[PDB]
Design a protein around this motif. Structure first.
Motif, PDB file in Angstrom:
ATOM      1  N   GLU B  62      -4.344 -18.447  22.060  1.00 24.18           N
ATOM      2  CA  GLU B  62      -4.277 -19.814  22.594  1.00 24.18           C
ATOM      3  C   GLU B  62      -3.154 -19.911  23.657  1.00 24.18           C
ATOM      4  O   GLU B  62      -3.410 -20.356  24.780  1.00 24.18           O
ATOM      5  N   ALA B  63      -1.928 -19.472  23.308  1.00 19.90           N
ATOM      6  CA  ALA B  63      -0.777 -19.497  24.221  1.00 19.90           C
ATOM      7  C   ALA B  63      -1.024 -18.638  25.461  1.00 19.90           C
ATOM      8  O   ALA B  63      -0.762 -19.084  26.581  1.00 19.90           O
ATOM      9  N   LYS B  64      -1.568 -17.417  25.267  1.00 20.49           N
ATOM     10  CA  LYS B  64      -1.892 -16.497  26.370  1.00 20.49           C
ATOM     11  C   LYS B  64      -2.811 -17.154  27.388  1.00 20.49           C
ATOM     12  O   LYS B  64      -2.515 -17.083  28.573  1.00 20.49           O
ATOM     13  N   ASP B  65      -3.883 -17.835  26.915  1.00 20.15           N
ATOM     14  CA  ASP B  65      -4.877 -18.515  27.748  1.00 20.15           C
ATOM     15  C   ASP B  65      -4.279 -19.725  28.488  1.00 20.15           C
ATOM     16  O   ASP B  65      -4.590 -19.942  29.654  1.00 20.15           O
ATOM     17  N   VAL B  66      -3.417 -20.503  27.808  1.00 16.90           N
ATOM     18  CA  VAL B  66      -2.778 -21.676  28.422  1.00 16.90           C
ATOM     19  C   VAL B  66      -1.795 -21.215  29.500  1.00 16.90           C
ATOM     20  O   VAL B  66      -1.880 -21.688  30.627  1.00 16.90           O
ATOM     21  N   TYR B  67      -0.902 -20.258  29.174  1.00 22.06           N
ATOM     22  CA  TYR B  67       0.097 -19.785  30.131  1.00 22.06           C
ATOM     23  C   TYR B  67      -0.498 -19.088  31.345  1.00 22.06           C
ATOM     24  O   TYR B  67       0.036 -19.234  32.439  1.00 22.06           O
ATOM     25  N   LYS B  68      -1.642 -18.399  31.173  1.00 25.82           N
ATOM     26  CA  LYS B  68      -2.329 -17.723  32.285  1.00 25.82           C
ATOM     27  C   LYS B  68      -2.686 -18.757  33.354  1.00 25.82           C
ATOM     28  O   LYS B  68      -2.449 -18.521  34.528  1.00 25.82           O
ATOM     29  N   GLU B  69      -3.183 -19.925  32.929  1.00 24.35           N
ATOM     30  CA  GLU B  69      -3.559 -21.007  33.827  1.00 24.35           C
ATOM     31  C   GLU B  69      -2.340 -21.832  34.285  1.00 24.35           C
ATOM     32  O   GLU B  69      -2.265 -22.221  35.452  1.00 24.35           O
ATOM     33  N   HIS B  70      -1.392 -22.097  33.362  1.00 27.53           N
ATOM     34  CA  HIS B  70      -0.210 -22.915  33.648  1.00 27.53           C
ATOM     35  C   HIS B  70       0.708 -22.301  34.723  1.00 27.53           C
ATOM     36  O   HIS B  70       1.161 -23.019  35.638  1.00 27.53           O
ATOM     37  N   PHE B  71       0.935 -20.966  34.643  1.00 30.80           N
ATOM     38  CA  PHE B  71       1.728 -20.201  35.620  1.00 30.80           C
ATOM     39  C   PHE B  71       0.881 -19.563  36.720  1.00 30.80           C
ATOM     40  O   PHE B  71       1.455 -19.019  37.669  1.00 30.80           O
ATOM     41  N   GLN B  72      -0.470 -19.577  36.575  1.00 26.61           N
ATOM     42  CA  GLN B  72      -1.395 -18.925  37.526  1.00 26.61           C
ATOM     43  C   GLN B  72      -0.988 -17.443  37.627  1.00 26.61           C
ATOM     44  O   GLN B  72      -1.000 -16.861  38.707  1.00 26.61           O
ATOM     45  N   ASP B  73      -0.582 -16.860  36.486  1.00 28.52           N
ATOM     46  CA  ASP B  73      -0.050 -15.506  36.378  1.00 28.52           C
ATOM     47  C   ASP B  73       0.104 -15.119  34.907  1.00 28.52           C
ATOM     48  O   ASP B  73       0.148 -15.991  34.027  1.00 28.52           O
ATOM     49  N   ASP B  74       0.208 -13.812  34.645  1.00 24.85           N
ATOM     50  CA  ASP B  74       0.407 -13.321  33.294  1.00 24.85           C
ATOM     51  C   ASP B  74       1.870 -12.911  33.193  1.00 24.85           C
ATOM     52  O   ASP B  74       2.317 -11.953  33.842  1.00 24.85           O
ATOM     53  N   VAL B  75       2.638 -13.733  32.492  1.00 24.47           N
ATOM     54  CA  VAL B  75       4.070 -13.560  32.307  1.00 24.47           C
ATOM     55  C   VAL B  75       4.397 -13.742  30.834  1.00 24.47           C
ATOM     56  O   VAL B  75       5.503 -13.480  30.404  1.00 24.47           O
ATOM     57  N   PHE B  76       3.408 -14.150  30.064  1.00 24.76           N
ATOM     58  CA  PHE B  76       3.538 -14.382  28.645  1.00 24.76           C
ATOM     59  C   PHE B  76       3.775 -13.093  27.838  1.00 24.76           C
ATOM     60  O   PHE B  76       3.014 -12.132  27.971  1.00 24.76           O
ATOM     61  N   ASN B  77       4.835 -13.091  27.006  1.00 20.94           N
ATOM     62  CA  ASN B  77       5.224 -11.967  26.161  1.00 20.94           C
ATOM     63  C   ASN B  77       4.288 -11.811  24.943  1.00 20.94           C
ATOM     64  O   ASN B  77       4.697 -12.033  23.796  1.00 20.94           O
ATOM     65  N   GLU B  78       3.032 -11.413  25.192  1.00 17.20           N
ATOM     66  CA  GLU B  78       2.050 -11.196  24.122  1.00 17.20           C
ATOM     67  C   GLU B  78       2.536 -10.097  23.161  1.00 17.20           C
ATOM     68  O   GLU B  78       2.445 -10.274  21.951  1.00 17.20           O
ATOM     69  N   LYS B  79       3.079  -8.991  23.707  1.00 18.24           N
ATOM     70  CA  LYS B  79       3.627  -7.856  22.943  1.00 18.24           C
ATOM     71  C   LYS B  79       4.731  -8.275  21.965  1.00 18.24           C
ATOM     72  O   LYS B  79       4.715  -7.855  20.812  1.00 18.24           O
ATOM     73  N   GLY B  80       5.664  -9.104  22.434  1.00 20.62           N
ATOM     74  CA  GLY B  80       6.785  -9.594  21.640  1.00 20.62           C
ATOM     75  C   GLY B  80       6.375 -10.460  20.471  1.00 20.62           C
ATOM     76  O   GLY B  80       6.879 -10.280  19.362  1.00 20.62           O
ATOM     77  N   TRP B  81       5.449 -11.390  20.704  1.00 21.64           N
ATOM     78  CA  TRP B  81       4.921 -12.260  19.659  1.00 21.64           C
ATOM     79  C   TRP B  81       4.031 -11.493  18.673  1.00 21.64           C
ATOM     80  O   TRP B  81       4.041 -11.812  17.482  1.00 21.64           O
ATOM     81  N   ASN B  82       3.275 -10.470  19.163  1.00 14.92           N
ATOM     82  CA  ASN B  82       2.447  -9.612  18.299  1.00 14.92           C
ATOM     83  C   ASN B  82       3.317  -8.797  17.350  1.00 14.92           C
ATOM     84  O   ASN B  82       2.949  -8.621  16.195  1.00 14.92           O
ATOM     85  N   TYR B  83       4.499  -8.355  17.830  1.00 16.16           N
ATOM     86  CA  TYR B  83       5.495  -7.633  17.045  1.00 16.16           C
ATOM     87  C   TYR B  83       5.955  -8.486  15.837  1.00 16.16           C
ATOM     88  O   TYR B  83       6.012  -7.975  14.716  1.00 16.16           O
ATOM     89  N   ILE B  84       6.222  -9.796  16.060  1.00 17.82           N
ATOM     90  CA  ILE B  84       6.627 -10.726  14.995  1.00 17.82           C
ATOM     91  C   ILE B  84       5.498 -10.879  13.962  1.00 17.82           C
ATOM     92  O   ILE B  84       5.751 -10.850  12.750  1.00 17.82           O
ATOM     93  N   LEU B  85       4.262 -11.047  14.449  1.00 17.18           N
ATOM     94  CA  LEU B  85       3.092 -11.201  13.587  1.00 17.18           C
ATOM     95  C   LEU B  85       2.885  -9.938  12.710  1.00 17.18           C
ATOM     96  O   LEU B  85       2.685 -10.058  11.503  1.00 17.18           O
ATOM     97  N   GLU B  86       2.984  -8.748  13.317  1.00 20.58           N
ATOM     98  CA  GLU B  86       2.763  -7.479  12.615  1.00 20.58           C
ATOM     99  C   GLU B  86       3.917  -7.066  11.699  1.00 20.58           C
ATOM    100  O   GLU B  86       3.662  -6.732  10.542  1.00 20.58           O
ATOM    101  N   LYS B  87       5.169  -7.094  12.191  1.00 19.74           N
ATOM    102  CA  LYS B  87       6.338  -6.708  11.410  1.00 19.74           C
ATOM    103  C   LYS B  87       6.752  -7.710  10.333  1.00 19.74           C
ATOM    104  O   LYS B  87       7.106  -7.298   9.230  1.00 19.74           O
ATOM    105  N   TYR B  88       6.722  -9.017  10.636  1.00 24.20           N
ATOM    106  CA  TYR B  88       7.237 -10.015   9.702  1.00 24.20           C
ATOM    107  C   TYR B  88       6.237 -11.020   9.182  1.00 24.20           C
ATOM    108  O   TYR B  88       6.646 -12.057   8.639  1.00 24.20           O
ATOM    109  N   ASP B  89       4.937 -10.709   9.298  1.00 28.17           N
ATOM    110  CA  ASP B  89       3.843 -11.591   8.895  1.00 28.17           C
ATOM    111  C   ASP B  89       4.016 -12.997   9.530  1.00 28.17           C
ATOM    112  O   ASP B  89       3.821 -14.021   8.878  1.00 28.17           O
TER     113      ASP B  89
END
Ligand SMILES: O=C(NC[C@@H]1CCOC1)c1ccc(NC(=O)N2Cc3ccccc3C2)cc1
Ligand SMILES: O=C(NC[C@@H]1CCOC1)c1ccc(NC(=O)N2Cc3ccccc3C2)cc1
Lengths: 464, 464
Positions: B62-89
């Motif tokens: 959801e955030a990735k899709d909103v930020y892609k349009e909001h910034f008209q660019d991919d600058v969103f830290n998908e990797k960083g947030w995925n790390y939190i989801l995987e390492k710390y549930d």
């Protein structure tokens, strides 16, 4: 959410106070006599809080228990609420008529009316005053934001000859400065009625869910630095922080806060000398936006422009105003409100600087430093039916003629000269004016008419 | 709610701006430089927005899709947030230390600190600045409400010989005048730290769910009229409306708005003559509370009291101040803010009227006419670890010494005279000032320390 617990406590006791044999309570909202207001926000409230099954047996019980303790007495209209649950499956027997959203109306005109559609529910009209009166907030944010757009439009047109980039010149920086997450979304959406630049991301989800745009998003942002992102490099490495940031965002516009230690040194020596080579190579679609964030807002903007004008190649536009090169802009994002925005643009024009050089970021001034007193947003009963006879009702306090309310059934009309008039005492029934501009937006638990966010923006456009 | 979409947009780009090899970002909150502030509201934010599994694969997308349009660019830290989801549930690897809620602290002291507990999550500390900085609102409401209690306590003690009924003398009328339902609950709860009288029902559910009280409810109300319940009777039947209302609430206190047409006539002729027989028979536990609601707040209060003093049996209490009979009181509920409350009580004392005669209702002045600038609530990075070396970080703008931030690891201590001191640069490590007053309230997705609403009230008590 429980609508039975979403009113001013004293409204719980009003069903016992109205004249006996009252079958109708008709009330209206106005911004009592900022000459004109943008009507916006009602659609959000209708969908989130008023529509569908809003009464359940559990909500009635919960309210009964809270009020028993809150008043230390049994004063709650359990019978009244049970009637709504049983006869209408918990749907509100209310009709709301409103001017279309985005409509720009002069002060002192009816904007919406509320009435019960069932005689038993005479008390419900004003039960929901509290929730509806909160419409003051998106109306005021939208109105105050549009008034700033008028100032910007005037000065940009005077100093540049056009309105290019007007919708990106007042950016919402108010997410942290607001009272809650919910306020953030409402307030940011109201600013987006007039502009396209926002950092208050909460506004995007609100518009998408309750209003809708043809475009994927209603607002846009650019990468920008904060003090943490500069100061983390250490006091002696401000130039390294700046170099890293502009190199990371070399192909997009990038805003860089430059006042962490000395704004004037950063502009003159760091951007203007040490890193000048990384700035003059930037695309027109990717400028560096220098951000001061302290000091007197006008004095700082003028001093920053005078510094930059001496380090960078300034041109004179067709109006005789000074213009920085296209790879370089300024953003004043500290202490911006409608009064300081006016002082800055006027001070820039006096020093022959074009308004195309600057953009403004506004936080508290845009979303928080506003009250219901600013436009005198008020909801009052103007008509009641008692013993089958309709009577025109109003307040007229001896010490304050400004608090005098309107009488009877109301309608909003276009005058022959194309202005607005609110007809009182059901005089709209005489077909002397055109059709009533208030439309049914809510009736018996259903939203009957909706506006897209695109229609609202069109309705809220400036004349220029 | 999506925490990935609950930050200022520019914070989405900060992970790319910090010095490479940064393993720690340590930030703090303070009310820079109303000499003392009531710390309240953090617990609400921790529970509603920060605790538990706040990251899911759906929230990332959801955030990735909103930020892609909001910034008209991919600058969103998908990797960083995925790390939190995987390492710390999806639990936040953050530690928050805070002063106990209800604590009254002088300006310019550390109130809470935030730091990441995982090196990969250095960017997380300031991502959550926006949500935590919103603590400014309950802090400011609680502080401004307590400052008003100090004024009331002073004048009530001076004009009577005690503080009886102090906690019911400033009633919250602010439900309709706030920006949202969420703000209403937060703001009303903050006023309830100091007082017990409220019409903002939303505050009760917030306290029950997030703080808790020994008592069934934290705040109380009494039945009261509004303009609609008086005016619905028709202009010539104001006496009938009054008689019906006081007869309906004959055994509980009842507030009656008396300025619909002429406040002075209603006090002198209606209450003072026509209906005087229904007032003088009322119990001490059930007074009639006359409510003016227009005109100059002080001039109106004094004139209403002079009128009542001539129609009703006034006594002189032990301090030599005039006192209405116990079945009769006044409530000034219009234009009340800290400044006008002060002018009224001082004006009453000058005319020899006891403060026991009056109560105040405050709406916008209590819950809405407040900004983050009032107490200079600010969140800033003070310490970072880069390449394994800790550095003391701060901002010090040349044009504003008031904006200079604190350096290094912070700790809050008691001085030898029992005052407060914030130690900077990790100096708390020297055992020269005893133990740190901040406690871990949140760590790795869990709330580690909580306070009841009763502990908060006790901590917020005035010295007197
Ligand atoms: O100039 C700008 N826009 C006009 C045109 C658009 C394309 O470029 C020109 C511009 C846009 C955004 C920003 N944002 C910031 O400075 N932030 C964001 C924010 C939020 C909260 C607190 C502080 C801050 C600092 C700056 C300049
Ligand atoms: O005096 C009072 N309390 C002190 C003591 C406590 C026990 O009794 C004495 C008192 C309490 C409540 C009220 N409420 C009203 O007047 N409302 C409520 C409200 C809400 C929103 C807008 C307008 C209004 C009018 C009045 C007086």
């Amino acid at each position: 959410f429980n609508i039975l617990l979403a009113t001013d406590s004293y409204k719980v006791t009003h069903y016992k106070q109205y004249p006996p044999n009252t079958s109708k309570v008709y009330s209206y909202f106005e911004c009592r006599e900022y000459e004109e207001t943008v009507f916006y926000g009602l659609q959000y409230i209708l969908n989130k809080y008023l529509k569908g099954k809003v009464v359940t047996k559990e909500k009635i019980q919960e309210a009964k228990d809270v009020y028993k303790e809150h008043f230390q007495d049994d004063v709650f209209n359990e019978k009244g609420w049970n009637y709504i649950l049983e006869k209408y499956d918990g749907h509100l027997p209310i009709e709301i008529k409103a001017v279309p959203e985005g409509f720009v109306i002069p002060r002192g005109n009816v904007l919406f009316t509320v009435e019960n559609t069932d005689p038993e529910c005479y008390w419900l009209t004003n039960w929901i005053e509290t929730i509806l009166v909160q419409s003051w907030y998106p109306i005021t944010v939208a109105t105050n934001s549009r008034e700033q757009k008028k100032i910007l439009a005037k000065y940009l047109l005077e100093t540049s000859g056009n309105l290019d980039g007007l919708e990106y010149k007042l950016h919402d920086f108010g997410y942290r400065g607001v009272s809650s997450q919910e306020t953030a979304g409402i307030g940011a959406s109201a600013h987006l009625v007039n502009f396209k630049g926002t950092d208050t991301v909460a506004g995007l989800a609100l518009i998408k869910k309750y209003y809708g745009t043809k475009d994927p998003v209603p607002g846009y942002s650019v990468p920008a630095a904060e003090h943490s992102t500069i100061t983390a490099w250490g006091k002696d490495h401000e130039k390294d922080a700046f170099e890293h940031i502009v190199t990371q965002f070399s192909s997009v516009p990038v805003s860089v806060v430059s006042d962490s230690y000395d704004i004037y040194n950063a502009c003159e020596k760091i951007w203007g000398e040490d890193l000048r080579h990384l700035i003059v190579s930037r695309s027109t679609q990717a400028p560096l936006i220098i951000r001061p964030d302290s000091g007197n807002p006008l004095d700082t903007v003028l001093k920053v422009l005078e510094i930059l004008g001496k380090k960078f190649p300034v041109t004179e536009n067709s109006k005789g105003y000074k213009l920085l090169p296209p790879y370089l802009r300024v953003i004043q994002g500290d202490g911006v409100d409608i009064n300081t925005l006016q002082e800055i643009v006027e001070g820039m024009k006096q020093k022959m600087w074009s308004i195309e050089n600057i953009a403004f970021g506004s936080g508290g001034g845009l979303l928080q430093k506003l009250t219901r007193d600013l436009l005198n947003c008020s909801f009052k009963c103007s008509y009641v039916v008692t013993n089958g006879l309709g009577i025109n009702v109003f307040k007229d306090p001896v010490a304050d003629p400004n608090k005098r309310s309107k009488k009877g059934r109301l309608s909003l009309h276009r005058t022959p000269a194309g202005n607005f008039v609110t007809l009182e005492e059901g005089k709209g029934d005489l077909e002397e004016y055109g059709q009533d501009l208030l439309h049914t937006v809510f009736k018996n638990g259903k939203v009957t008419k909706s506006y897209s966010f695109d229609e609202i923006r069109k309705n809220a456009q400036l004349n220029i």
